[PDB]
Write a protein that holds these residues in place. Structure first.
Motif, PDB file in Angstrom:
ATOM      1  N   UNK A   1       0.834  -1.194   0.000  1.00 44.92           N
ATOM      2  CA  UNK A   1       0.000   0.000   0.000  1.00 44.92           C
ATOM      3  C   UNK A   1       0.872   1.248   0.000  1.00 44.92           C
TER       4      UNK A   1
ATOM      5  N   UNK B   1      -1.441   6.401  -2.489  1.00 49.40           N
ATOM      6  CA  UNK B   1      -2.841   6.014  -2.560  1.00 49.40           C
ATOM      7  C   UNK B   1      -3.543   6.334  -1.241  1.00 49.40           C
TER       8      UNK B   1
ATOM      9  N   UNK C   1     -10.611   4.609   0.188  1.00 48.67           N
ATOM     10  CA  UNK C   1     -11.922   5.231  -0.037  1.00 48.67           C
ATOM     11  C   UNK C   1     -13.024   4.588   0.791  1.00 48.67           C
ATOM     12  N   UNK C   2     -14.271   4.962   0.520  1.00 43.71           N
ATOM     13  CA  UNK C   2     -15.419   4.367   1.184  1.00 43.71           C
ATOM     14  C   UNK C   2     -15.863   3.129   0.403  1.00 43.71           C
ATOM     15  N   UNK C   3     -17.017   2.571   0.767  1.00 42.32           N
ATOM     16  CA  UNK C   3     -17.538   1.378   0.106  1.00 42.32           C
ATOM     17  C   UNK C   3     -19.024   1.558  -0.172  1.00 42.32           C
TER      18      UNK C   3
ATOM     19  N   UNK D   1     -23.003   9.049  -1.594  1.00 36.47           N
ATOM     20  CA  UNK D   1     -22.802   9.137  -3.040  1.00 36.47           C
ATOM     21  C   UNK D   1     -24.163   9.184  -3.735  1.00 36.47           C
TER      22      UNK D   1
ATOM     23  N   UNK E   1     -19.357  21.573  -0.600  1.00 37.82           N
ATOM     24  CA  UNK E   1     -19.485  20.524  -1.606  1.00 37.82           C
ATOM     25  C   UNK E   1     -18.307  20.550  -2.574  1.00 37.82           C
TER      26      UNK E   1
ATOM     27  N   UNK F   1     -15.384  17.765  -3.001  1.00 40.03           N
ATOM     28  CA  UNK F   1     -15.186  17.178  -4.323  1.00 40.03           C
ATOM     29  C   UNK F   1     -13.730  17.293  -4.754  1.00 40.03           C
TER      30      UNK F   1
ATOM     31  N   UNK G   1     -11.565  14.871  -2.692  1.00 36.80           N
ATOM     32  CA  UNK G   1     -11.696  13.496  -3.162  1.00 36.80           C
ATOM     33  C   UNK G   1     -11.030  13.303  -4.518  1.00 36.80           C
ATOM     34  N   UNK G   2     -11.058  14.328  -5.374  1.00 34.73           N
ATOM     35  CA  UNK G   2     -10.384  14.231  -6.665  1.00 34.73           C
ATOM     36  C   UNK G   2      -8.874  14.151  -6.490  1.00 34.73           C
ATOM     37  N   UNK G   3      -8.330  14.878  -5.515  1.00 37.06           N
ATOM     38  CA  UNK G   3      -6.894  14.863  -5.242  1.00 37.06           C
ATOM     39  C   UNK G   3      -6.526  13.640  -4.397  1.00 37.06           C
ATOM     40  N   UNK G   4      -6.861  12.467  -4.933  1.00 34.69           N
ATOM     41  CA  UNK G   4      -6.608  11.207  -4.251  1.00 34.69           C
ATOM     42  C   UNK G   4      -6.452  10.103  -5.285  1.00 34.69           C
TER      43      UNK G   4
ATOM     44  N   UNK H   1      -6.941   6.400  -6.029  1.00 37.15           N
ATOM     45  CA  UNK H   1      -7.805   5.362  -5.488  1.00 37.15           C
ATOM     46  C   UNK H   1      -7.284   3.992  -5.906  1.00 37.15           C
ATOM     47  N   UNK H   2      -7.621   2.985  -5.111  1.00 39.11           N
ATOM     48  CA  UNK H   2      -7.223   1.606  -5.361  1.00 39.11           C
ATOM     49  C   UNK H   2      -8.428   0.852  -5.937  1.00 39.11           C
ATOM     50  N   UNK H   3      -8.855  -0.272  -5.367  1.00 37.45           N
ATOM     51  CA  UNK H   3     -10.018  -0.998  -5.858  1.00 37.45           C
ATOM     52  C   UNK H   3     -10.579  -1.835  -4.718  1.00 37.45           C
TER      53      UNK H   3
ATOM     54  N   UNK I   1     -15.333   7.138  -9.415  1.00 36.47           N
ATOM     55  CA  UNK I   1     -13.874   7.159  -9.428  1.00 36.47           C
ATOM     56  C   UNK I   1     -13.313   7.304  -8.021  1.00 36.47           C
TER      57      UNK I   1
ATOM     58  N   UNK J   1      -9.836   1.787 -10.921  1.00 33.91           N
ATOM     59  CA  UNK J   1      -8.416   1.483 -10.971  1.00 33.91           C
ATOM     60  C   UNK J   1      -8.166   0.053 -10.491  1.00 33.91           C
TER      61      UNK J   1
END
Ligand SMILES: [Mg+2]
Ligand SMILES: [Mg+2]
Ligand SMILES: [Mg+2]
Ligand SMILES: [Mg+2]
Ligand SMILES: [Mg+2]
Ligand SMILES: [Mg+2]
Ligand SMILES: [Mg+2]
Ligand SMILES: [Mg+2]
Ligand SMILES: [Mg+2]
Ligand SMILES: [Mg+2]
Ligand SMILES: [Mg+2]
Ligand SMILES: [Mg+2]
Ligand SMILES: [Mg+2]
Ligand SMILES: [Mg+2]
Lengths: 201, 132, 76, 305, 23
Positions: free
Chosen positions: A3, A7, A10-12, A17, A21, A25, A28-31, A33-35, D274, D280
């Motif tokens: 890890x 990275x 995030x949430x699940x 969502x 605001x 936003x 969250x964009x300046x991140x 993300x994994x999967x 995203x 990803x």
RNA sequence: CCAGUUGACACAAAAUAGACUACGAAAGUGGCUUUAACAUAUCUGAACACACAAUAGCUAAGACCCAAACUGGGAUUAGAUACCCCACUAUGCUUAGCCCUAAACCUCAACAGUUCAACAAAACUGCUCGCCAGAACACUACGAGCCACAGCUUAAAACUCAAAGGACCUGGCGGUGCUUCAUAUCCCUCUAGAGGAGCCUGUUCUGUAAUCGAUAAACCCCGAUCAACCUCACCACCUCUUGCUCAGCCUAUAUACCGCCAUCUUCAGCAAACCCUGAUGAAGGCUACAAAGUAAGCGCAAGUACCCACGUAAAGACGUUAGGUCAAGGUGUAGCCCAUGAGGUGGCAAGAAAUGGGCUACAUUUUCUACCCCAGAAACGAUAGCCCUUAUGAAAUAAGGGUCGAAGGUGGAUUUAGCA
């Protein structure tokens, strides 16, 4: 650990969502993300507490079989509860729950401990000092207790799903070995109380 | 640590070459390969005999010139061509150089059934890597 | 006198290189090796202003006279 | 210092010879010739990137240092020569003079960057003092010329990571608004064809998802994206899965479906997906089996104890 | 200095006192 | 008679002021009334005398609830006249027969004065007596004085030696108080193989004609990606000082090497060449409202390639165990030169005893079966070894078919990697 620090986690769920605001936003964009894994799902119905329980129940390091067995046992318990409820009265949806998620929530509430005995020391001798614990730690302890009780490695007769269903039905309403162990732990903690004056933190 | 081929710091103006200053984990990184022979190849076979012949040729060429081979050679097999790149040092006169070179070339060409030839390393500066 | 309770260390370096140094010494100074100690105040601003103005004028006139006289002499 | 000029002249003669080699007429060649050379008559193969053959005119590679520091009977280039690094202190004095002038009137770089710009090896506290002076100058009456002169030593903002590569709806191939995608999970790849209409079932590898993965976790993973976007039934697919096994293929299909959805979805939901984590590839991938250990990271038992 | 030169003196004095008390 | 409001019996002890300044040659002192209180003011001039007692002690005793030498009973206790809990006997307050020794130190004598071997109670001269210029023996035998009869003033001479004593330099150490702090590395928390046990496997070492390598730290599925004559490199019988070697040695000196490499490192720096800090000695070079570093050379850093840049194989500086090895292989020097080499011929494979590194089960998880997940036995594990053997051989090693079909019900405070 693989890890990388670039990275983030995030949430699940998709509760929020559904759209300060702009600031959130941009954050969250300046991140990077994994999967998400296979078990963790965004289904609002699939409560994440059962997901964590199945994760803790990983037998032999395999989540597929553990999740399958847990879902089968939950379905069996739900069938039994609805047979005891549906095939009885008319529409008494207040005295008996309506989903296995609520069943597991009630089981946790009845098994979630509140005191955590600890052998704190001050130089070279332990001391009985009840140490607090947050909700996550208490939930994890309750899950571990349920796991070690269901798989005590001493039954030598009943089956895994049947044993799990029976123990769930027991823990439902003040029954089973998990609540007995919780009561024993509470008694052991309340035995010697005048000893919490030796904590370093 | 590991001193497979390196030399830790000591003085400042000591003798040292490229091969006499490298780490084992830099065999192909900071260091090259002194033997691009047709042996250790894949998926091609034939490696034992090729390595044996390379070692034999290298030892023979090192024994030829007396006190003039600091580093090993760089054999090159372009099919039927044996190209040698020895780190030779200016010894004495060019007559002896030419005589010995021609003698060795003819001998190896008549023995190995393959043309062989070498070239001196007429450079007034070694391949010093670390100042040490 | 720097910000710390200690004179400038350049005096020892100058003494270690044969250099005649001048110094606006004061009560907190130590005119031990200074070749031309110049006692005077260092707290008032007008004092330092006058010091620097005199230095500028003196060195400027010295350089001008140097140029002039050296040219007139080399012309010989 | 003479060795620098000697090597410069030697490399100049070498470059002259190199240019004379080619019989063409362009003498002021670019990096094309060097690339062709490294590709043909200079293939080293060293894994490293520094010892590789990068022959270039040392007119710009060979660094420069302080030339002459004195002339006719000493006389340096400033009155702060004996202070070491006269350039930095002279610039600081000029900044202080500008500060006093402004008072009468009424991102940053790294230490190594400033050292490369100048010819002095400054420390960290001197750089902090310089930054303090520059901040005092920027604060002392905000103007324009001084602001630009101070920003000269700074960089722009250049904001990144904002918009998402919106994929087209793709209407070619057939008369359906499909969309290609992929997915990775422990060495795996796939190519899905998620349509836009068709409120019914989905063809997983040409067969329904009933006899393929009877497990409920697989169906939950397949629904993950459609459930996140709320466009559940209205979607038909004819993907072709490959590689992996069970959870790997499930995650690959999930990622492919999420990408196909984000292809033609409002920017809000696209960004939400995203940021939620379903596009990803997580770092959880088939790692390198440790040779100096039994399994993966599990080291020997009584190693340190 | 410290109390180090008197250690041997005390040792000798204690040995003498023990020899006296003994016989 | 434990907590006391209405009160009670000691020759005790000076609650803040005591943060105050004194005399006495020095002991010596602090809550109070009174007798008597500070000598010469030029200094010194007995360690053959007049007197004090620092604290204590012998003798005759008075005598303070309050303390201990003699103390019993009990944490810990392997071995505690102290330590952790109760008070008490010579003695602390008093008059006499007495050694006056101390750290009676403020280790620095009183007067006249003037402006640094190191630690530092700054430096320079006169005045008076006392001190010594080998320690351990030698705060002692012996001699002289004392009502001490364990002592005091002095207190020496033999065998041993290069002495002996004090200070100084940056370090290892801090169960030193503390600052940055340790992220699976550490306790609080756990995920889990292994601990009681089946199978492959050796360790301390046994055995002949079947060496083994520090075979602890870094060996015990390490070299062995493995021991039928090869592999075992270890020995005897047919013969040698041409032994296949114009001989070698797998024979040895780890107090002499080349050779590969973990360890501290999960740090943080080492120093050539210069210039300074110690009345220039062992050493150091020290902080930006800046008090001496530039720092050849080796470094993290730049990752060397990849799953990008964390993470992986491996460090990551001068180095850490005369580090493992004279035998993984070669080697200074010694020995064999009727060998410990061998040309041809013959020789092991098992754990007396314990153990651990990997695959395995104590539960429906040992069997997964036609389906990898829509349908379930023995109610246990249902081994090894042995026979038929894939292969072959003068003695089986991974395992397919038959038989046995076991060992014990996570078994000891737990052990090691893990922040995906
Ligand atoms: Mg006198
Ligand atoms: Mg007299
Ligand atoms: Mg007395
Ligand atoms: Mg008492
Ligand atoms: Mg008494
Ligand atoms: Mg009294
Ligand atoms: Mg006396
Ligand atoms: Mg005393
Ligand atoms: Mg050894
Ligand atoms: Mg290492
Ligand atoms: Mg690196
Ligand atoms: Mg690595
Ligand atoms: Mg060694
Ligand atoms: Mg023999």
């Amino acid at each position: 650990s693989r890890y990388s620090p670039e990275f983030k986690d995030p949430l699940i769920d998709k509760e929020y969502y559904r759209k300060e605001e702009k600031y959130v936003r941009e954050l969250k964009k300046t991140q990077l993300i994994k999967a998400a894994p296979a078990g963790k799902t965004s289904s609002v119905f699939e409560d994440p507490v059962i997901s964590k329980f199945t994760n803790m129940m990983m037998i032999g390091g395999n989540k597929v079989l553990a999740r399958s067995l847990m879902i089968q046992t939950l379905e069996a318990v739900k069938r039994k509860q609805f047979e005891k409820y549906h095939a009885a009265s008319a529409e008494e949806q207040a005295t008996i729950e309506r989903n296995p998620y609520t069943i597991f929530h009630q089981a946790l509430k009845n098994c979630e401990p509140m005191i955590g005995l600890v052998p704190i020391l001050k130089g070279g001798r332990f001391y009985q000092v009840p140490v607090p614990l947050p909700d996550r730690r208490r939930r994890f302890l309750a899950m571990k207790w349920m796991i070690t009780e269901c798989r005590d490695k001493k039954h030598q007769r009943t089956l895994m799903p049947e044993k799990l269903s029976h123990k769930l039905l027991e823990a439902f309403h003040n029954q089973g070995p998990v609540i007995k162990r919780k009561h024993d732990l509470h008694k052991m903690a309340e035995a010697n109380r005048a000893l919490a004056h030796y904590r370093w933190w | 640590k590991n001193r497979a081929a390196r030399v830790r710091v000591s003085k400042g103006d000591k003798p040292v070459t490229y091969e006499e200053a490298h780490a084992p984990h830099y065999i192909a990184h900071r260091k090259g390969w002194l033997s691009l022979h047709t042996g250790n190849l894949d998926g091609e076979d034939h490696a034992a005999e090729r390595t044996v012949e390379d070692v034999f040729l290298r030892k023979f060429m090192w024994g030829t010139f007396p006190g003039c081979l600091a580093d090993q050679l760089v054999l090159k097999r372009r099919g039927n061509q044996l190209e040698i790149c020895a780190v030779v040092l200016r010894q004495l006169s060019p007559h002896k150089y030419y005589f010995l070179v021609g003698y060795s070339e003819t001998l190896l060409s008549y023995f190995y059934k393959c043309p062989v030839r070498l070239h001196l390393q007429t450079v007034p500066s070694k391949v010093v890597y670390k100042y040490l | 006198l720097n910000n710390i309770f200690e004179p400038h260390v350049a005096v020892r370096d100058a003494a270690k290189m044969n250099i005649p140094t001048v110094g606006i010494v004061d009560t907190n100074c130590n005119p031990c090796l200074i070749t031309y100690p110049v006692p005077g105040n260092d707290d008032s601003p007008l004092a330092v202003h006058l010091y620097c103005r005199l230095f500028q004028t003196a060195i400027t006139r010295a350089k001008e006279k140097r140029q002039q006289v050296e040219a007139l002499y080399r012309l010989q | 210092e003479d060795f620098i000029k000697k090597q410069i002249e030697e490399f100049n003669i070498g470059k002259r010879h190199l240019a004379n080699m080619m019989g063409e007429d362009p003498e002021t060649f670019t990096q094309e010739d060097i690339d062709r050379a490294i590709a043909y008559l200079f293939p080293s193969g060293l894994f490293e990137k520094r010892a590789r053959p990068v022959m270039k005119h040392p007119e710009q590679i060979f660094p420069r240092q302080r030339a002459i520091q004195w002339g006719e009977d000493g006389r340096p280039f400033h009155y702060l020569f004996y202070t070491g690094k006269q350039s930095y202190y002279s610039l600081m004095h000029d900044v202080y003079g500008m500060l006093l002038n402004l008072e009468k009137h009424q991102r940053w770089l790294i230490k190594e960057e400033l050292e490369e710009m100048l010819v002095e090896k400054l420390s960290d506290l001197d750089y902090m003092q310089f930054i303090r002076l520059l901040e005092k100058l920027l604060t002392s009456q905000c103007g324009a010329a001084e602001e630009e002169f101070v920003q000269r030593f700074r960089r722009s903002v250049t904001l990144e990571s904002k918009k998402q590569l919106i994929e087209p709806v793709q209407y070619d191939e057939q008369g359906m608004a499909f969309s290609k995608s992929e997915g990775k999970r422990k060495t795996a790849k796939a190519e899905a064809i998620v349509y836009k209409h068709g409120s019914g079932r989905i063809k997983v590898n040409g067969i329904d998802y009933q006899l393929y993965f009877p497990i409920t976790q697989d169906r939950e993973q397949l629904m993950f994206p459609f459930h996140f976007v709320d466009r559940l039934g209205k979607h038909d697919v004819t993907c072709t899965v490959s590689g992996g096994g069970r959870s790997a293929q499930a995650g690959a299909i999930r990622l492919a479906m999420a990408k196909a959805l984000c292809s033609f979805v409002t920017e809000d939901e696209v960004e939400w997906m995203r940021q939620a984590g379903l596009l990803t590839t997580d770092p959880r991938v088939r790692e390198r089996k440790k040779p100096g250990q039994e399994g993966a990271r599990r080291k020997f038992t009584w190693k340190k104890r | 200095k410290n109390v180090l030169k008197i250690r041997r003196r005390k040792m000798n004095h204690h040995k003498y006192r023990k020899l006296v008390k003994k016989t």
